[PDB]
Design a protein around this ligand. Sequence first.
Ligand code: FLF
Ligand code: FLF
Lengths: 115, 116
Amino acid sequence: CPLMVKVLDAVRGSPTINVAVHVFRKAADDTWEPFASGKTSESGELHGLTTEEEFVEGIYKVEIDTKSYWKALGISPFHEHAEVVFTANDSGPRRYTIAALLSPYSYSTTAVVTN
Amino acid sequence: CPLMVKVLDAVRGSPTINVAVHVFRKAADDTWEPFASGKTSESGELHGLTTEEEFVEGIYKVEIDTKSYWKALGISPFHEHAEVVFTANDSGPRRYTIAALLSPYSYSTTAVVTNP
Ligand SMILES: O=C(O)c1ccccc1Nc1cccc(C(F)(F)F)c1
Ligand SMILES: O=C(O)c1ccccc1Nc1cccc(C(F)(F)F)c1
């Protein structure tokens, strides 16, 4: 589909399995409208969030429930969550993969945007 | 100085100067109230945002205006901003350094937490 989320664990060297991901679209009044959500698979991936026809131009937020993940492993986390906010655009590439690499006190996020 | 923000440019290998940073604290009614704001210096650091008295227990949001930084260099970046949300002082007062490393399509953020 046009949007995919992938999550990795930098402590155990593994995909992060069963972590909650919420997607939002910015409304005209500047509040975040909930859009789609799911849990990452055994491969740390979340597919099928939206479709080409639903995923119009606009500003989107992806929120990964990183705190619940670290709590499940018995490790004290710093962040409440990891959030990515971006403008989706009709001119350039259209397939978005949002990747996040997770540590208890640090995260990195990258977008891979293709054709 | 219980809260400091430090920002680095991963393309040029330099501190990022004059980057806007806005800090918010979660209120009892669950809204974000304006806490402090500032811009990074020559060294890419922002000191003096708050005091040990003012910086009580709570959930804080730090929003770094990364988009304006890149657009001022001619670059249309992926992210609208970099935002760090965290519980502070839950086991007593600490000193927090929030660091962000910036690329047009990526950022990494870390916290260094020390006991004064
Ligand atoms: O590992 C994948 O398959 C991956 C895919 C898309 C985007 C990023 C991906 N990995 C990823 C994600 C975050 C940080 C790093 C690392 F810095 F380790 F290379 C690698
Ligand atoms: O660069 C500093 O002096 C620094 C200070 C405090 C916390 C982190 C700090 N540095 C930091 C922050 C994010 C990513 C990286 C890197 F990955 F490049 F090593 C280094």
